[PDB]
Amino acid sequence: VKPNYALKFTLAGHTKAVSSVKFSPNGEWLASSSADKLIKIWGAYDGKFEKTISGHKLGISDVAWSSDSNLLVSASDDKTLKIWDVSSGKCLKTLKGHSNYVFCCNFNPQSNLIVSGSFDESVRIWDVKTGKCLKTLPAHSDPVSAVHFNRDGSLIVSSSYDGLCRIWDTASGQCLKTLIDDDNPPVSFVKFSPNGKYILAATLDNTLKLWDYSKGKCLKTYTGHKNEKYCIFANFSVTGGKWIVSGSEDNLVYIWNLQTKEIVQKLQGHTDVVISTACHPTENIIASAALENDKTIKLWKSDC
Amino acid sequence: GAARAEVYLR
């Protein structure tokens, strides 16, 4: 079986490179962040523009939804994160503490904590309610490219241009595991699988890898795309067939069969690097976003 | 700008 993603909508509005796209967990919305300092909200099924959320002083590298789709957190070059009430557009808290650009962010499943990664080489854990920095982890020796909580929020996985993937105990801040595969290319993205058993990691040597983190073993490799320069997001698509989805520096969206590792579809249309992709939580819909020469987001739909 | 939209060299 192979999917049949087809272009449905193109979303224009950002004035600079788009950096990250994410669907709300309730499937109603798409949030996008950009180097233009703005967050934009769009309808997930029709691509209709909803509103702009402003307040950061410099460009934004990431945005993430809370579990209940009520809040967003954004990470900016202004060295802050901001927690937003999506329905009102209000900035509830500004998270100050990183000493350099904030690159990545996520809520935990309970949505009471935020994790962030920065050019200052640290991973920070923040209290959502008070906006206070609870813990600072001296995590890496180069910028932190991604941070993500596991299924119950007990662990954090982080990646960095230093070539490492690390697993941290949320409660103690202890480094439980360092994962690396015999070459040291920058690790440009990492996330836990929906079931929490695996970690999907991207490296700047044109490779995605699926790790069993309990065993510290690489189980699957996905190749064929171009990724040597940018921190491109990758996803598990689970609504229909089980795929791995990623953007690429050759301007395409790549889709692989998770089990066989074969490329099953390539989505053509963007005119610059596809930096971010997201998979809709219930429908076979992919959102893709591109860099400065393109500035658009595309919504693609498949029958499987 | 935004750091994700830039190249970072070790």
From Swiss-Prot, chain A:
<dbReference type="InterPro" id="IPR020472">
    <property type="entry name" value="G-protein_beta_WD-40_rep"/>
</dbReference>
<dbReference type="GO" id="GO:0044666">
    <property type="term" value="C:MLL3/4 complex"/>
</dbReference>
<keyword id="KW-0156">Chromatin regulator</keyword>
<dbReference type="GO" id="GO:0051302">
    <property type="term" value="P:regulation of cell division"/>
</dbReference>
<dbReference type="GO" id="GO:0006355">
    <property type="term" value="P:regulation of DNA-templated transcription"/>
</dbReference>
<dbReference type="InterPro" id="IPR019775">
    <property type="entry name" value="WD40_repeat_CS"/>
</dbReference>
<dbReference type="GO" id="GO:0045893">
    <property type="term" value="P:positive regulation of DNA-templated transcription"/>
</dbReference>
<dbReference type="GO" id="GO:0001501">
    <property type="term" value="P:skeletal system development"/>
</dbReference>
<comment type="similarity">
    <text>Belongs to the WD repeat WDR5/wds family.</text>
</comment>
<dbReference type="GO" id="GO:0005654">
    <property type="term" value="C:nucleoplasm"/>
</dbReference>
<dbReference type="GO" id="GO:0044545">
    <property type="term" value="C:NSL complex"/>
</dbReference>
<dbReference type="GO" id="GO:0000122">
    <property type="term" value="P:negative regulation of transcription by RNA polymerase II"/>
</dbReference>
<dbReference type="GO" id="GO:0072686">
    <property type="term" value="C:mitotic spindle"/>
</dbReference>
<protein>
    <recommendedName>
        <fullName>WD repeat-containing protein 5</fullName>
    </recommendedName>
</protein>
<dbReference type="GO" id="GO:0140672">
    <property type="term" value="C:ATAC complex"/>
</dbReference>
<dbReference type="GO" id="GO:0140004">
    <property type="term" value="F:histone H3Q5ser reader activity"/>
</dbReference>
<feature type="repeat" description="WD 7">
    <location>
        <begin position="269"/>
        <end position="303"/>
    </location>
</feature>
<feature type="repeat" description="WD 4">
    <location>
        <begin position="139"/>
        <end position="178"/>
    </location>
</feature>
<dbReference type="GO" id="GO:0140109">
    <property type="term" value="F:histone H3K4me1 reader activity"/>
</dbReference>
<dbReference type="GO" id="GO:0005634">
    <property type="term" value="C:nucleus"/>
</dbReference>
<feature type="repeat" description="WD 3">
    <location>
        <begin position="98"/>
        <end position="138"/>
    </location>
</feature>
<keyword id="KW-0804">Transcription</keyword>
Curated annotation (Swiss-Prot), chain B:
<comment type="similarity">
    <text>Belongs to the class V-like SAM-binding methyltransferase superfamily. Histone-lysine methyltransferase family. TRX/MLL subfamily.</text>
</comment>
<feature type="short sequence motif" description="WDR5 interaction motif (WIN)">
    <location>
        <begin position="1"/>
        <end position="6"/>
    </location>
</feature>
<comment type="function">
    <text>Histone methyltransferase that catalyzes methyl group transfer from S-adenosyl-L-methionine to the epsilon-amino group of 'Lys-4' of histone H3 (H3K4) via a non-processive mechanism. Part of chromatin remodeling machinery predominantly forms H3K4me1 and H3K4me2 methylation marks at active chromatin sites where transcription and DNA repair take place. Likely plays a redundant role with KMT2C in enriching H3K4me1 marks on primed and active enhancer elements. Plays a central role in beta-globin locus transcription regulation by being recruited by NFE2.</text>
</comment>
<protein>
    <recommendedName>
        <fullName>Histone-lysine N-methyltransferase 2B</fullName>
    </recommendedName>
</protein>
<comment type="subunit">
    <text>Component of the menin-associated histone methyltransferase complex, at least composed of KMT2B/MLL4, ASH2L, RBBP5, WDR5, DPY30, MEN1; the complex interacts with POLR2A and POLR2B via MEN1. Interacts with NFE2. Interacts with KDM6B. Interacts (via WIN motif) with WDR5. Interacts (via MBM motif) with MEN1. Forms a core complex with the evolutionary conserved subcomplex WRAD composed of WDR5, RBBP5, ASH2L/ASH2 and DPY30 subunits; WRAD differentially stimulates the methyltransferase activity.</text>
</comment>
